[PDB]
Coordinates of C-alpha atoms and ligand atoms in Angstrom, one line a residue:
Chain A
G2 CA -56.1 44.6 247.7
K3 CA -52.4 43.9 246.8
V4 CA -51.6 40.9 244.6
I5 CA -48.4 39.3 245.7
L6 CA -46.6 36.4 244.0
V7 CA -44.4 34.3 246.2
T8 CA -42.3 31.3 245.2
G9 CA -41.7 28.1 247.1
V10 CA -44.4 28.5 249.8
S11 CA -44.7 24.8 250.8
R12 CA -42.2 24.9 253.7
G13 CA -39.7 27.1 255.4
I14 CA -39.7 30.8 254.9
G15 CA -42.1 30.5 252.0
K16 CA -45.1 29.1 253.8
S17 CA -44.6 31.7 256.5
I18 CA -44.3 34.6 254.1
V19 CA -47.9 34.0 253.1
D20 CA -48.8 33.3 256.7
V21 CA -47.6 36.8 257.8
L22 CA -49.2 38.4 254.7
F23 CA -52.6 37.0 255.7
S24 CA -52.1 38.4 259.2
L25 CA -51.4 42.1 258.5
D26 CA -54.2 42.4 256.0
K27 CA -57.5 40.7 255.1
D28 CA -57.8 41.9 251.4
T29 CA -54.4 40.8 250.1
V30 CA -54.4 37.9 247.6
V31 CA -51.3 35.7 247.4
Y32 CA -50.5 33.4 244.4
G33 CA -48.0 30.7 245.5
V34 CA -46.0 28.0 243.7
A35 CA -44.1 25.0 244.8
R36 CA -43.5 21.3 243.8
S37 CA -45.2 19.6 246.7
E38 CA -49.0 19.3 246.2
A39 CA -50.0 18.3 249.7
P40 CA -48.8 21.4 251.7
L41 CA -50.2 23.7 249.0
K42 CA -53.7 22.3 249.1
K43 CA -53.6 22.7 252.8
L44 CA -52.9 26.4 252.5
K45 CA -56.0 27.0 250.3
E46 CA -58.1 24.8 252.6
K47 CA -57.0 27.2 255.4
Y48 CA -57.3 30.5 253.6
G49 CA -59.9 29.9 250.9
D50 CA -60.2 32.6 248.2
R51 CA -57.1 34.5 249.5
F52 CA -54.6 31.9 248.4
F53 CA -54.1 30.2 245.0
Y54 CA -51.4 27.6 244.3
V55 CA -49.6 26.3 241.2
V56 CA -47.8 22.9 241.7
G57 CA -44.7 22.7 239.5
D58 CA -41.0 23.3 239.3
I59 CA -40.1 27.0 238.8
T60 CA -37.4 25.9 236.3
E61 CA -40.1 25.1 233.9
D62 CA -41.4 28.3 232.2
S63 CA -44.7 26.5 231.5
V64 CA -45.7 26.8 235.1
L65 CA -44.2 30.3 235.5
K66 CA -46.6 31.6 232.9
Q67 CA -49.3 29.6 234.7
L68 CA -48.6 31.5 237.9
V69 CA -48.5 34.9 236.3
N70 CA -51.5 34.6 234.0
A71 CA -53.6 33.1 236.8
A72 CA -53.2 36.3 238.9
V73 CA -54.1 38.4 235.9
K74 CA -57.0 36.2 234.8
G75 CA -58.2 36.0 238.5
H76 CA -57.6 39.6 239.7
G77 CA -56.1 41.5 236.8
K78 CA -53.3 42.9 239.0
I79 CA -49.7 42.2 239.9
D80 CA -48.2 44.2 242.7
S81 CA -45.2 42.4 244.4
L82 CA -43.0 39.4 243.6
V83 CA -41.1 37.7 246.5
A84 CA -38.6 35.2 245.1
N85 CA -38.4 32.9 248.1
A86 CA -37.5 29.5 246.5
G87 CA -34.1 27.8 246.2
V88 CA -32.0 24.7 246.8
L89 CA -28.7 24.2 248.5
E90 CA -27.2 21.2 246.7
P91 CA -24.7 20.5 245.4
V92 CA -22.9 21.0 248.7
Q93 CA -19.4 19.8 247.7
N94 CA -15.7 20.8 248.0
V95 CA -13.9 22.3 245.0
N96 CA -12.0 19.0 244.5
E97 CA -15.3 17.2 243.9
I98 CA -17.4 19.4 241.7
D99 CA -20.2 18.4 239.3
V100 CA -20.7 21.3 236.8
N101 CA -24.0 19.9 235.6
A102 CA -25.2 20.0 239.2
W103 CA -24.0 23.6 239.5
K104 CA -26.2 24.6 236.6
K105 CA -29.1 22.7 238.1
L106 CA -28.5 24.8 241.3
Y107 CA -28.3 28.0 239.2
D108 CA -31.5 27.1 237.3
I109 CA -33.5 27.3 240.5
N110 CA -32.0 30.2 242.5
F111 CA -31.1 32.5 239.7
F112 CA -32.2 31.5 236.2
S113 CA -35.7 30.6 237.6
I114 CA -36.1 34.2 238.9
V115 CA -34.6 36.0 235.8
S116 CA -37.2 34.2 233.7
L117 CA -40.0 34.8 236.3
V118 CA -39.5 38.5 236.4
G119 CA -39.3 38.8 232.6
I120 CA -42.7 37.3 232.4
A121 CA -44.3 39.3 235.3
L122 CA -42.4 42.6 234.6
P123 CA -45.1 44.0 232.2
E124 CA -47.7 43.5 234.8
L125 CA -45.4 44.7 237.6
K126 CA -44.8 48.0 235.7
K127 CA -48.6 48.6 235.4
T128 CA -48.8 48.9 239.2
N129 CA -45.3 50.4 239.9
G130 CA -44.9 47.5 242.3
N131 CA -41.9 46.0 244.2
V132 CA -39.6 43.1 243.4
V133 CA -38.1 41.6 246.6
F134 CA -35.4 39.0 246.3
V135 CA -34.7 36.6 249.1
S136 CA -30.9 36.5 249.1
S137 CA -28.4 35.0 251.6
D138 CA -25.3 36.0 253.6
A139 CA -23.2 33.6 251.6
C140 CA -22.9 36.1 248.7
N141 CA -19.9 37.9 250.4
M142 CA -18.9 35.4 253.1
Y143 CA -17.0 32.2 252.7
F144 CA -18.9 28.9 253.5
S145 CA -17.4 25.5 253.1
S146 CA -18.7 23.5 250.1
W147 CA -21.1 26.5 249.3
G148 CA -19.3 27.4 246.1
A149 CA -22.5 27.0 244.0
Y150 CA -25.0 28.3 246.6
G151 CA -22.7 31.2 247.6
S152 CA -22.2 32.6 244.1
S153 CA -25.8 31.8 243.4
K154 CA -27.0 34.6 245.6
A155 CA -24.2 36.9 244.5
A156 CA -25.6 36.9 241.0
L157 CA -29.1 37.6 242.5
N158 CA -27.7 40.7 244.2
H159 CA -26.5 41.9 240.8
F160 CA -29.8 41.1 239.1
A161 CA -31.5 43.1 241.9
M162 CA -29.3 46.1 241.4
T163 CA -29.6 45.9 237.6
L164 CA -33.4 45.6 237.7
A165 CA -33.7 48.6 240.0
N166 CA -31.4 50.7 237.8
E167 CA -32.8 49.6 234.5
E168 CA -36.6 49.9 234.9
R169 CA -37.2 52.4 237.7
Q170 CA -41.0 52.0 237.3
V171 CA -40.6 49.0 239.5
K172 CA -38.3 48.8 242.6
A173 CA -36.0 45.9 243.3
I174 CA -34.3 44.8 246.5
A175 CA -32.3 41.8 247.8
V176 CA -32.5 41.1 251.6
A177 CA -30.8 38.2 253.4
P178 CA -32.9 36.5 256.1
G179 CA -29.9 35.5 258.2
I180 CA -30.0 32.0 259.7
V181 CA -33.6 30.7 259.9
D182 CA -34.9 27.5 261.4
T183 CA -36.1 25.9 258.2
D184 CA -35.5 22.5 256.6
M185 CA -32.3 23.9 254.9
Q186 CA -30.5 24.1 258.3
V187 CA -31.9 20.6 258.9
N188 CA -30.1 19.5 255.7
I189 CA -27.0 21.3 256.9
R190 CA -27.0 19.6 260.3
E191 CA -28.0 16.0 259.5
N192 CA -27.0 15.4 255.9
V193 CA -24.7 17.6 253.8
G194 CA -22.9 18.8 256.9
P195 CA -20.9 15.8 258.2
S196 CA -20.4 14.5 254.6
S197 CA -18.6 17.4 252.8
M198 CA -18.7 20.4 255.0
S199 CA -15.8 21.2 257.3
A200 CA -15.7 21.0 261.1
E201 CA -15.5 24.7 262.1
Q202 CA -18.6 25.9 260.3
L203 CA -20.6 22.7 261.0
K204 CA -20.5 23.0 264.8
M205 CA -21.5 26.7 264.3
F206 CA -24.7 25.8 262.4
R207 CA -25.5 23.1 265.0
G208 CA -24.4 25.0 268.0
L209 CA -26.6 27.9 267.0
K210 CA -29.7 25.6 267.3
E211 CA -29.2 23.9 270.7
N212 CA -28.5 27.3 272.3
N213 CA -31.7 28.7 270.5
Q214 CA -30.3 31.5 268.3
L215 CA -32.0 30.2 265.1
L216 CA -34.7 32.6 263.9
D217 CA -38.2 31.3 263.5
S218 CA -39.5 31.2 259.9
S219 CA -41.8 34.2 260.6
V220 CA -39.1 36.6 261.9
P221 CA -37.6 37.4 258.5
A222 CA -40.7 36.5 256.5
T223 CA -42.3 39.6 258.1
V224 CA -39.7 41.8 256.4
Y225 CA -40.3 40.3 253.0
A226 CA -44.1 40.6 253.6
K227 CA -44.1 44.3 254.5
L228 CA -41.7 45.1 251.7
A229 CA -44.1 43.4 249.4
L230 CA -47.2 45.1 251.0
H231 CA -46.2 48.7 251.6
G232 CA -43.3 49.2 249.2
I233 CA -39.5 49.5 249.0
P234 CA -37.9 52.8 250.2
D235 CA -36.2 54.9 247.7
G236 CA -32.8 55.1 249.5
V237 CA -32.4 51.4 249.5
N238 CA -33.7 50.5 246.0
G239 CA -31.3 48.0 244.5
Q240 CA -29.1 47.6 247.5
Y241 CA -28.3 44.3 249.3
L242 CA -29.1 44.4 253.0
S243 CA -30.1 42.0 255.8
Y244 CA -33.4 41.6 257.6
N245 CA -32.2 43.3 260.7
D246 CA -30.7 46.4 258.9
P247 CA -31.7 49.7 260.6
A248 CA -32.9 50.9 257.2
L249 CA -35.5 48.1 257.3
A250 CA -36.5 48.7 260.9
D251 CA -40.0 49.8 259.7
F252 CA -40.5 46.2 258.3
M253 CA -39.8 44.2 261.5
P254 CA -42.5 42.4 263.5
Chain B
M1 CA 12.7 24.3 233.0
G2 CA 10.4 27.0 234.3
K3 CA 6.6 27.2 234.9
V4 CA 3.7 26.1 232.7
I5 CA 0.8 28.5 232.3
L6 CA -2.7 27.8 230.9
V7 CA -4.4 30.8 229.4
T8 CA -7.9 30.8 227.8
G9 CA -9.1 33.0 225.0
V10 CA -5.7 33.5 223.4
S11 CA -7.1 34.9 220.2
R12 CA -8.4 38.5 220.6
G13 CA -7.8 41.4 223.0
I14 CA -6.2 40.7 226.4
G15 CA -5.8 36.9 226.1
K16 CA -3.4 37.2 223.2
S17 CA -1.5 40.0 225.0
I18 CA -1.1 37.9 228.1
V19 CA 0.8 35.4 225.9
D20 CA 3.0 38.2 224.5
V21 CA 3.9 39.4 228.0
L22 CA 4.6 36.0 229.5
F23 CA 7.2 35.3 226.8
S24 CA 8.4 38.9 227.2
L25 CA 9.6 38.5 230.8
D26 CA 10.7 34.9 230.8
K27 CA 12.5 32.3 228.6
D28 CA 11.5 29.1 230.4
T29 CA 7.8 29.7 230.4
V30 CA 5.6 27.6 228.1
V31 CA 2.0 28.6 227.5
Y32 CA -0.9 26.3 226.7
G33 CA -3.7 28.3 225.1
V34 CA -7.2 27.5 224.0
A35 CA -9.7 29.3 221.7
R36 CA -12.2 28.7 218.9
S37 CA -10.4 30.6 216.1
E38 CA -7.6 28.6 214.5
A39 CA -6.3 31.6 212.5
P40 CA -4.6 33.6 215.3
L41 CA -3.5 30.5 217.2
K42 CA -1.6 28.9 214.3
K43 CA 0.2 32.3 213.9
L44 CA 1.3 32.3 217.6
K45 CA 2.7 28.8 217.0
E46 CA 5.1 30.0 214.4
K47 CA 6.2 33.1 216.4
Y48 CA 7.4 31.4 219.5
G49 CA 7.7 27.7 218.5
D50 CA 8.2 25.1 221.2
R51 CA 7.2 27.7 223.9
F52 CA 3.6 27.7 222.8
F53 CA 0.9 25.0 222.4
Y54 CA -2.8 25.5 221.6
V55 CA -6.1 23.6 221.6
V56 CA -8.8 24.7 219.0
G57 CA -12.3 24.4 220.4
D58 CA -14.9 26.0 222.6
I59 CA -14.5 25.9 226.4
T60 CA -18.2 25.0 226.9
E61 CA -17.3 21.4 226.0
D62 CA -15.4 19.4 228.7
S63 CA -13.6 17.5 225.9
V64 CA -11.7 20.7 225.0
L65 CA -10.9 21.5 228.7
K66 CA -9.5 18.0 229.3
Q67 CA -7.6 18.1 226.0
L68 CA -5.9 21.3 227.1
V69 CA -5.0 20.0 230.6
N70 CA -3.9 16.5 229.5
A71 CA -1.7 18.1 226.8
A72 CA 0.1 20.2 229.4
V73 CA 1.1 17.2 231.5
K74 CA 2.0 14.8 228.7
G75 CA 4.1 17.7 227.3
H76 CA 5.8 19.3 230.3
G77 CA 4.5 17.2 233.3
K78 CA 2.9 20.0 235.4
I79 CA 0.6 23.0 235.5
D80 CA 1.8 26.0 237.5
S81 CA -0.9 28.7 236.8
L82 CA -4.3 29.2 235.4
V83 CA -5.3 32.3 233.5
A84 CA -9.1 32.4 232.9
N85 CA -9.2 35.1 230.3
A86 CA -12.3 34.1 228.3
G87 CA -15.6 36.0 228.3
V88 CA -18.4 37.2 226.1
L89 CA -20.5 40.3 226.4
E90 CA -23.6 39.2 224.4
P91 CA -26.4 39.0 225.2
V92 CA -26.8 42.7 225.9
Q93 CA -30.5 43.3 226.3
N94 CA -33.1 45.1 228.5
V95 CA -34.9 43.5 231.5
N96 CA -38.1 43.7 229.4
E97 CA -36.4 41.7 226.6
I98 CA -34.6 38.9 228.5
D99 CA -33.7 35.6 226.8
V100 CA -32.9 33.0 229.5
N101 CA -31.4 30.5 227.1
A102 CA -29.1 33.2 225.8
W103 CA -28.3 34.2 229.4
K104 CA -27.2 30.7 230.2
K105 CA -24.7 30.4 227.3
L106 CA -22.9 33.5 228.7
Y107 CA -22.7 31.8 232.1
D108 CA -21.5 28.6 230.4
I109 CA -18.7 30.6 228.8
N110 CA -17.8 33.1 231.5
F111 CA -18.6 31.0 234.6
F112 CA -19.6 27.4 234.0
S113 CA -16.6 26.8 231.7
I114 CA -14.2 28.2 234.2
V115 CA -15.5 26.2 237.2
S116 CA -15.3 23.1 235.0
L117 CA -11.7 23.8 234.1
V118 CA -10.5 24.6 237.6
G119 CA -11.6 21.2 238.9
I120 CA -10.1 19.2 236.0
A121 CA -6.8 20.9 236.5
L122 CA -7.0 21.1 240.3
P123 CA -5.1 17.8 240.9
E124 CA -2.2 19.4 238.9
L125 CA -2.5 22.9 240.4
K126 CA -2.1 21.6 243.9
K127 CA 1.0 19.6 243.1
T128 CA 2.8 22.9 242.2
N129 CA 1.1 25.3 244.6
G130 CA -0.3 27.1 241.6
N131 CA -2.0 30.4 241.2
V132 CA -5.4 30.6 239.5
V133 CA -5.9 34.1 238.0
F134 CA -9.5 35.1 237.1
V135 CA -10.1 38.0 234.7
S136 CA -13.2 39.7 236.0
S137 CA -14.7 43.1 235.2
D138 CA -15.9 46.4 236.8
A139 CA -19.5 45.4 236.1
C140 CA -19.5 43.1 239.2
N141 CA -20.0 46.2 241.5
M142 CA -21.1 49.1 239.3
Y143 CA -24.2 49.2 237.2
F144 CA -24.0 49.1 233.4
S145 CA -27.0 49.6 231.1
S146 CA -28.4 46.3 229.6
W147 CA -25.3 44.4 230.9
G148 CA -27.6 42.0 232.7
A149 CA -26.0 38.6 232.1
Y150 CA -22.4 39.9 231.7
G151 CA -22.3 42.0 234.9
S152 CA -24.0 39.2 237.0
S153 CA -21.7 36.5 235.7
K154 CA -18.6 38.4 236.8
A155 CA -20.2 38.7 240.3
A156 CA -20.5 34.9 240.5
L157 CA -16.9 34.4 239.3
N158 CA -15.5 36.8 242.0
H159 CA -17.2 34.8 244.7
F160 CA -15.7 31.6 243.3
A161 CA -12.3 33.1 243.6
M162 CA -12.8 33.6 247.3
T163 CA -14.4 30.1 247.7
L164 CA -11.5 28.5 245.8
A165 CA -8.9 30.3 247.9
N166 CA -10.6 29.5 251.2
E167 CA -11.3 25.8 250.5
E168 CA -8.0 24.7 248.9
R169 CA -5.1 26.5 250.8
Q170 CA -2.7 24.7 248.4
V171 CA -3.9 27.0 245.6
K172 CA -4.1 30.8 245.3
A173 CA -7.1 32.4 243.5
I174 CA -7.6 36.1 242.7
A175 CA -10.1 38.1 240.5
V176 CA -8.5 41.1 238.9
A177 CA -10.5 43.5 236.6
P178 CA -8.6 45.1 233.7
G179 CA -10.5 48.4 233.8
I180 CA -11.5 49.3 230.3
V181 CA -9.2 48.1 227.5
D182 CA -8.8 48.9 223.8
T183 CA -9.8 45.4 222.7
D184 CA -12.3 43.9 220.2
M185 CA -15.0 43.8 222.9
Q186 CA -15.0 47.6 223.3
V187 CA -15.3 48.0 219.6
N188 CA -18.4 45.9 219.7
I189 CA -19.8 48.2 222.4
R190 CA -19.4 51.5 220.6
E191 CA -20.8 50.2 217.3
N192 CA -22.8 47.0 217.6
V193 CA -24.7 46.3 220.8
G194 CA -24.5 50.0 221.9
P195 CA -27.1 51.6 219.7
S196 CA -29.2 48.5 220.3
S197 CA -29.8 47.6 223.9
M198 CA -27.8 50.1 226.0
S199 CA -28.5 53.6 227.3
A200 CA -27.4 56.8 225.7
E201 CA -25.5 58.4 228.6
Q202 CA -23.3 55.3 229.2
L203 CA -22.4 55.1 225.5
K204 CA -21.3 58.7 225.5
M205 CA -19.2 57.6 228.4
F206 CA -17.7 54.7 226.4
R207 CA -17.4 56.4 223.0
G208 CA -15.9 59.5 224.7
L209 CA -13.5 57.1 226.5
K210 CA -12.0 56.2 223.1
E211 CA -12.0 59.8 221.8
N212 CA -10.2 60.8 225.0
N213 CA -7.5 58.2 224.3
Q214 CA -8.4 56.7 227.8
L215 CA -8.7 53.2 226.4
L216 CA -5.8 51.2 227.9
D217 CA -3.7 49.2 225.6
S218 CA -4.0 45.4 226.3
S219 CA -0.3 45.4 227.2
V220 CA -0.9 47.1 230.6
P221 CA -3.5 44.8 232.3
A222 CA -2.0 41.6 230.7
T223 CA 1.3 42.3 232.4
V224 CA -0.6 42.1 235.8
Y225 CA -2.3 38.8 234.7
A226 CA 1.1 37.5 233.5
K227 CA 3.2 38.5 236.5
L228 CA 0.6 37.1 238.8
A229 CA 0.9 33.7 237.0
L230 CA 4.8 33.8 237.0
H231 CA 5.8 35.2 240.4
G232 CA 2.7 34.0 242.1
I233 CA -0.2 35.6 243.9
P234 CA 0.7 37.3 247.2
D235 CA -1.0 36.1 250.4
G236 CA -2.3 39.6 251.4
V237 CA -4.7 39.6 248.4
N238 CA -5.5 35.9 248.2
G239 CA -9.2 35.4 247.2
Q240 CA -10.0 39.1 246.9
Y241 CA -11.4 41.0 244.0
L242 CA -9.1 43.9 242.9
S243 CA -8.3 46.0 239.8
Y244 CA -5.1 46.0 237.7
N245 CA -3.9 49.3 239.2
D246 CA -4.6 48.5 242.9
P247 CA -1.7 49.6 245.2
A248 CA -1.5 46.1 246.5
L249 CA -0.9 44.8 242.9
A250 CA 1.8 47.4 242.3
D251 CA 4.7 45.0 241.9
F252 CA 2.8 43.3 239.0
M253 CA 2.7 46.5 236.9
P254 CA 5.1 47.3 234.0
Ligands
LIG301 N1 -32.8 28.8 256.1 C1 -31.6 29.6 256.0 O1 -30.8 29.5 256.9 C2 -31.4 30.6 254.8 C3 -30.3 31.4 254.8 C4 -30.2 32.2 253.8 C5 -31.0 32.3 252.7 N2 -32.1 31.4 252.8 C6 -33.1 31.5 251.6 O2 -34.6 31.5 252.2 C7 -35.4 31.0 251.3 C8 -36.3 30.0 251.9 O3 -35.7 29.4 253.0 P1 -35.4 27.8 253.0 O4 -34.6 27.4 251.8 O5 -34.5 27.4 254.2 O6 -36.8 26.9 253.1 P2 -36.9 25.4 252.4 O7 -37.9 24.6 253.2 O8 -35.5 24.7 252.6 O9 -37.3 25.5 250.8 C9 -37.8 26.8 250.3 C10 -38.8 26.6 249.2 O10 -38.3 26.6 248.0 C11 -39.2 25.6 247.2 N3 -38.5 25.1 245.9 C12 -37.3 24.8 245.8 N4 -37.1 24.4 244.5 C13 -38.2 24.6 243.8 C14 -38.6 24.4 242.5 N5 -37.6 23.9 241.5 N6 -39.9 24.7 242.1 C15 -40.8 25.1 243.0 N7 -40.4 25.3 244.3 C16 -39.2 25.0 244.7 C17 -39.5 24.6 247.9 O11 -40.8 24.0 247.6 P3 -40.8 22.3 247.3 O12 -40.0 21.6 248.3 O13 -42.3 21.8 247.3 O14 -40.2 22.1 245.9 C18 -39.5 25.2 249.4 O15 -40.8 25.3 249.8 C19 -34.4 30.3 250.3 O16 -34.4 30.9 249.1 C20 -33.0 30.4 251.0 O17 -32.0 30.5 249.9 C21 -32.3 30.6 253.8
LIG302 N1 -11.9 44.7 227.0 C1 -12.5 45.3 228.1 O1 -12.8 46.5 228.2 C2 -12.8 44.4 229.4 C3 -13.3 44.9 230.5 C4 -13.5 44.2 231.6 C5 -13.3 42.8 231.5 N2 -12.9 42.2 230.4 C6 -12.7 40.8 230.3 O2 -11.2 40.5 229.8 C7 -11.3 39.3 229.1 C8 -10.7 39.5 227.7 O3 -10.9 40.9 227.3 P1 -11.8 41.2 225.9 O4 -13.2 40.6 226.2 O5 -11.9 42.6 225.7 O6 -11.2 40.4 224.6 P2 -12.0 40.0 223.3 O7 -11.5 40.7 222.1 O8 -13.5 40.3 223.5 O9 -11.8 38.3 223.1 C9 -12.4 37.5 224.1 C10 -11.6 36.2 224.1 O10 -12.3 35.2 224.7 C11 -12.2 34.0 223.7 N3 -13.5 33.1 223.8 C12 -14.7 33.5 224.0 N4 -15.5 32.4 224.0 C13 -14.7 31.4 223.9 C14 -15.0 30.0 223.9 N5 -16.5 29.6 224.0 N6 -14.0 29.1 223.7 C15 -12.7 29.6 223.6 N7 -12.5 30.9 223.6 C16 -13.5 31.8 223.7 C17 -12.2 34.5 222.5 O11 -11.5 33.6 221.5 P3 -12.4 33.1 220.2 O12 -13.4 34.2 219.9 O13 -11.5 32.8 219.0 O14 -13.2 31.8 220.6 C18 -11.2 35.7 222.7 O15 -9.9 35.3 222.7 C19 -12.7 39.0 229.0 O16 -13.0 37.9 229.8 C20 -13.5 40.3 229.5 O17 -14.8 39.9 230.1 C21 -12.6 43.0 229.3

């Protein structure tokens, strides 16, 4: 009866993370959070007493404490925390940077999680649970106009390594899902791509779709689900890996 | 004349020593510094004269960043390098005692203030094929106890050096760590924030580092940051993260 908290579960990898979690087990309870009310009420209508949703922006700590205390006031237990919520904008070249937009990007993919763990860490230590970060391949690779988003996940990799080395009662990990057929790649192909992104990387993100090499949302979500359901191995605690790493072969579909 | 360099945090530690080395190897270089303490800046003005200019204020405000860049073009007409030597260690705290508002102010000094200054000066940096030098730290890769916000902010700055060097081929960015230097920050580690938020084993590593005379003088790494701004960043290490004593950065050593 593991209690798993997942962020941004209204679309993309988030909604599938709770979909795979409800497929491998029938006693696991998931507390989700997002900003769109319609797709979150559909998840509870579909799963009933196994899913509970909080509609709000993770940048507001008022709804972060709403998500954590609801799991304690509902089940008195906090096992896993999968940080699967983030934005991509601002997608802009270094010659056209808005710093206040960069902090807005950092307040969702990094500062939102540092505050989220600090609120749920006392409950996570009581179960010796796992903290799984949903990182990205842009933390060590160059991507055009991804200066904010690329360094966004690089700081998450450091926060994953620091958390695993500081409080060893819990275990932290940061795993990149690769390239997944979500609405983010839709934004890369039909909006922020032709505007500010270059030509070489753009035709790659679009050529990888027509030839059908884009992963479905449930392929990497199964890795984050099993890592949140069975636990993180000891030899990879705090490291940064990808979903298809041989060390995580026991978490593949 | 020669080149014009912009160095941040020219008050304490390494930032002041970078100014001393830049004037030590050249006589045409003029440095435009910025810092919040007027006491050590007005002293550097009377030591070098018309080779040094300063702006008193915090780098978190864009009005100070623009006042430093605009003064460098109305005075000498160009900007040839950028030395981002401004950082803060606090808040040092445990994961169970995290203050998010205090974590942001570190990022707004060590990261968001730098990414704001690079773009304001980017139109001038590209006109001279300049070199942007980032002063990072060893905490971007290794783990340090309770160095949560500091170690993670250097990791974001290192990625920005690679992004800046790959997007604008007219500029050259690098992120060099000075190792562990005998500055005012290491004094704060062994005495202030040490017996407060950090472990015991890592402090016996840092306090034993001073008792072993292993603390580098700020003259050694500042020479690497200064020579990289004068002679320029090589192409074989453009956008990478290195240390001061890297074999690729040997020609920038004293
Ligand atoms: N797709 C890829 O190629 C790829 C690659 C590398 C990493 N990732 C990472 O995988 C994770 C999910 O994939 P995705 O981004 O592609 O799916 P997505 O559909 O683009 O969005 C992911 C979720 O994040 C939620 N979210 C964003 N900001 C929020 C906020 N301020 N408050 C509450 N919820 C918020 C969104 O819910 P609402 O819309 O309702 O606010 C959304 O459901 C992301 O973290 C992404 O960085 C994806
Ligand atoms: N010393 C080491 O062992 C070590 C190791 C790794 C990396 N580093 C990095 O090397 C750089 C300098 O070394 P240090 O930290 O040891 O010297 P330091 O004695 O700690 O002084 C830090 C400098 O940054 C300036 N500064 C900080 N915030 C500022 C702001 N908001 N506006 C303007 N100036 C500001 C300070 O000037 P004011 O206080 O007057 O404003 C000061 O000149 C730092 O970035 C540090 O992260 C140092």
